[PDB]
Design a protein around this ligand. Structure first.
Ligand SMILES: OC[C@H]1O[C@H](O[C@H]2[C@H](O)[C@@H](O)[C@@H](O)O[C@@H]2CO)[C@H](O)[C@@H](O)[C@@H]1O
Ligand SMILES: OC[C@H]1O[C@H](O[C@H]2[C@H](O)[C@@H](O)[C@@H](O)O[C@@H]2CO)[C@H](O)[C@@H](O)[C@@H]1O
Lengths: 440, 444
């Protein structure tokens, strides 16, 4: 028995490793926490393969897609444990009447400002152009945040009416997509204008923004509670407040519930549930993670009634209420990827705001059709890379269809040692398919 | 079924498999390796489905025409006889088992169809096909029939089709041209029209098969039949006093039967290849081995020089050799599989009346020239969205996993709605299909 944990690199993974080493002292079970990049994308590729984690930590929005593929184990908490966490966090990890993860903490973006460079932060977005010009004369800048991840750009886009999927009477409408309406265009136009008027740089990312704010070079940034730890060390005199309003409407950040899912085929399910229920989601467990990087508003009632007395957590909750909970439907991946493309292309000038958001809408409504419209041209006649050629040969053998002579000539000419190892990998792929189903 | 330390042999049911079983018993006594002879139906079709799976034979006995297709898929082991053994067999039978400069089987016997006639009912067999309609009416007046043979396999219908120029693939400069198919020329139309006229004019019945034809001749109900040397054994016991001669001519041109060289191939993935080579070279392809098979059912003109020089003094073997020269050796190229399947449909449909002779052979010709492109033009409509039989959708899901391609939402929920183990056993067959692919690849 052993536990392998995956968590994002901006969260307190060292603190989590301490509760894991607490677990090991008590149980003798090894616990390993890793922070791979794009782990939310890697998980469906490694689930049920033995190459993945027993426990995956990410915002709740990605877990519905995992569940629809049958990759997440359904959790079975006791009523007593169920009541230890806030009902709002349990709903974030519910998908088709089943719980598919343990909710950990509520995270929401907030405005972080340098009190020495700006004692009175702007209440509206429109104050920032005039405010940037004034600080630029003093060798500073008004605002810097990560423009290349749509999580950070969305609060302004949704402010005046942008939305992902329309939500009417308890269900999401996967075909009513609102990334291309008037309010979305209004917010994204304003953001591009800031870049054209040299108030922001379109290439700015997370590290540049956070380094700039912690170096006292920018007055404001937009970030979540995890950022507070490094501002503390940097001794920047900072505050956390509500995001500026746009066209009088408040900014509407997408609210994330950090959640821990278990691989449906993991041999260590009961060890995973025990670690999550009895070690991490306790006062001491979450305090260990919180000390490394702040979790935000935790789902555990006892600890959150103490956390709620910090004005930074109060600001997070207030920004969180102005926003909305992220959907957990599988189409969210298409939503994020399309919106990431649109905001970067508009900010860099490769498309207009109207061209960028329309394409973003077409991706979303067309993505449920899958990554493949039709086998690559000439594949069933033997044209293509050998790995894809062996895949289609395996397919035709599975279906008892006689392959073309072009395929058979490719089948005869491929190297013995290379074709064998490729086809052994195919067997490892089917081995995973078997485990996913047997875990149902 | 395939196991190490034993040999499993597949041979057609009309051949002398009991005689072959006796040489296998002799092999077992000498070596301790048990030999098991089986005669499943459609074994020439079943072998490619079971090759390299352990459910097939170590040795397959069939005419050479099917072995080139087996070789193109890498299912046949390459043969490595010494030059000394090579000269024990006639050089031309080795040509029947040569494919892409490699030998892929052992030649056993040369088989050719011949005209078998009841000497008591007809002392002077016809020289031309056109004599038989007039010959039938006279025997029908006595309650008999002139000719009945297996119409359901084109092997028997082909000698009359090829007489006036029907051919499989043209032969240019020692090579076979896959794109010049001669199933639709005037002579092909001419020969099959004659055969349909016989059925219209109630000289033959389109439903006649091997079992019906052979029963009547052995019961003295028909004067003539068309069959190969394997058939002589049942006519001997029946005490019908018969003869074996040349097939009648049609439009002055001789009948050109496709000649088959009965051959033994070895599975490219067999653990008993050395045992197979040793059994084939040292026990069966000997005077004693082939005589044991020939006593059960006649092999025809064997490829082994020493034994055939005794066989050739039999007039029936002379007639078999004679018809063999009037015909041509079959190509062993993979498209022969398409050719035979195609002219089987054409001859059955024209004989049963479902199409005209000219349309039947034209469509027969198109299938032959289209077979290189494979059995699939494109995936069934809606397959990538989850619509289709359960096995093919899970196959395409496996394919998208192999290639790291995101599946559609229709595919994902079909994946969610499938029976838990109905999918698990479908996927285990997938696990073993790849296991077979691996053995085929590693067998080179
Ligand atoms: O930007 C798209 C991205 O947004 C969210 O990711 C957040 C995450 O929730 C936070 O914990 C933190 O790691 O910042 C991320 C943005 O870089 C969604 O959770 C994610 O699915 C989506 O792709
Ligand atoms: O009829 C199609 C069939 O013809 C030949 O098969 C022969 C075989 O050669 C003989 O040994 C004997 O078994 O009669 C068979 C016909 O019933 C071809 O060799 C074969 O490929 C083809 O399918």
């Amino acid at each position: 028995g052993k536990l392998v944990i995956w968590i994002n690199g901006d969260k307190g993974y060292n603190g989590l490793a301490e509760v894991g080493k607490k677990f090991e002292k008590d149980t003798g079970i090894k616990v390993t926490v890793e922070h791979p990049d794009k782990l939310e994308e890697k998980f469906p590729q490694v689930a049920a393969t033995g190459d993945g984690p027993d426990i995956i930590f990410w915002a709740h929005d990605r877990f519905g897609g995992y569940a629809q593929s049958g990759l997440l184990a359904e959790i079975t908490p006791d009523k007593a444990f169920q009541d230890k966490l806030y009902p709002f966090t349990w709903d974030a990890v519910r998908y088709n009447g089943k719980l598919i993860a343990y909710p950990i903490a509520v995270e929401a973006l907030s405005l972080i400002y340098n009190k020495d460079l700006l004692p009175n932060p702007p209440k509206t977005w429109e104050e920032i152009p005039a405010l940037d010009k004034e600080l630029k004369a003093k060798g500073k800048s008004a605002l810097m945040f990560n423009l290349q991840e749509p999580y950070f750009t969305w609060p302004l886009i949704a402010a005046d009416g942008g939305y992902a999927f329309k939500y009417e009477n308890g269900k999401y409408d996967i075909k009513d997509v609102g990334v291309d309406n008037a309010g979305a265009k209004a917010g994204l136009t304003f953001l591009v204008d800031l870049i054209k008027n040299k108030h922001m740089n379109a290439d700015t990312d997370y590290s540049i923004a956070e380094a700039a704010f912690n170096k006292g070079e920018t007055a404001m940034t937009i970030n979540g509670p995890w950022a507070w730890s490094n501002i503390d060390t940097s001794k920047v005199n900072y505050g956390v407040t509500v995001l500026p309003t746009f066209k009088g409407q408040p900014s509407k950040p997408f609210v994330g519930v950090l959640s821990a899912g278990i691989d449906a085929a993991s041999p260590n399910k009961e060890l995973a549930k025990e670690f999550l229920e009895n070690y991490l989601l306790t006062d001491e467990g979450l305090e260990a993670v919180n000390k490394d990087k702040p979790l935000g508003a935790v789902a555990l009632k006892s600890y959150e009634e103490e956390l709620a007395k910090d004005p930074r957590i109060a600001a997070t909750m207030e920004n969180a209420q102005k926003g909305e909970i992220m959907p957990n439907i599988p189409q969210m991946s298409a939503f994020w990827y399309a919106v990431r493309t649109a905001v970067i292309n508009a900010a860099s000038g490769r498309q207009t705001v109207d061209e960028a958001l329309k394409d973003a809408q077409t991706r979303i409504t067309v993505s449920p059709f899958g990554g493949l419209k039709r086998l690559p041209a000439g594949l069933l006649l033997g044209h293509g890379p050998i790995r894809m050629v062996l895949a289609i040969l395996a397919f035709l053998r599975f279906t008892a269809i006689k392959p073309s002579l072009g395929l058979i000539n490719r089948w005869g000419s491929v190297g013995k040692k290379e074709a064998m190892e490729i086809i052994k990998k195919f067997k490892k792929d089917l081995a995973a398919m078997l485990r996913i189903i047997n875990a149902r």
